[PDB]
């Protein structure tokens, strides 16, 4: 309930090198530099929906905690993934595959700190509630 709402990206750090390590297409990496996405969060009982709204693509994962599902990632790849909750502010998504991705979404009131990691490359992206 307190995590629901919309949050606009305010600061991004090292997201370019994160996409270099993840290995996405040039056009995708190019569009990410200028993109200022909005995270939309909705919860219906046990079912969570995290959206990324932007001119590039509007993406959506819907999931129950701890239950694996397939995600069509914005880079075009379909990955097996799971989301688990840590404490009650923190949601940790794991995207399995050859390069395993950890995406921590840390909800701190009107600020969300998203920390994405692959290999030895980490990006931090901060969103502010709108």
């Amino acid at each position: 309930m307190p995590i629901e709402g919309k949050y606009k990206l305010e600061k991004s750090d090292n997201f370019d090198k994160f996409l270099d390590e993840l290995g996405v297409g040039f056009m995708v990496k190019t569009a990410a530099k200028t993109l200022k996405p909005t995270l939309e969060v909705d919860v219906q009982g046990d079912t969570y929906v995290f959206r990324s709204l932007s001119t590039f693509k509007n993406t959506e994962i819907k999931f129950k905690l701890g239950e694996e599902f397939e995600e069509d990632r914005a880079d075009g790849k379909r990955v097996k993934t799971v989301v688990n909750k840590e404490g009650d502010n923190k949601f940790i998504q794991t995207q399995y595959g050859d390069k395993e991705v950890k995406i921590v979404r840390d909800f701190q009131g009107d600020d969300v700190v998203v920390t994405a990691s692959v290999g030895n490359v980490t990006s931090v992206r901060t969103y502010k509630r709108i």
Side-chain angles (χ1 to χ4, degrees), residues 10-64:
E10 289 278 350
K11 162 65 177 167
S12 173
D13 185 69
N14 206 47
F15 195 53
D16 46 8
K17 293 228 168 201
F18 169 82
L19 295 176
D20 285 332
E21 181 84 3
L22 181 58
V24 307
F26 173 83
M27 273 201 285
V28 164
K29 178 204 184 169
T30 296
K33 296 192 194 307
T34 79
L35 221 64
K36 185 103 199 293
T38 308
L39 161 62
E40 174 168 38
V41 178
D42 195 302
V43 190
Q44 181 179 78
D46 56 13
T47 295
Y48 292 74
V49 174
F50 296 164
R51 290 185 199 91
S52 173
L53 308 176
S54 80
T55 58
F56 172 72
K57 190 169 300 202
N58 291 340
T59 71
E60 171 178 302
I61 58 171
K62 177 183 333 293
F63 59 88
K64 295 183 189 34

Side-chain angles (χ1 to χ4, degrees), residues 88-101:
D88 36 8
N89 291 349
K90 200 165 283 193
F91 294 78
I92 318 183
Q93 184 185 352
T94 306
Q95 294 173 335
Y96 304 105
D98 276 1
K99 296 193 180 99
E100 181 162 313
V101 187

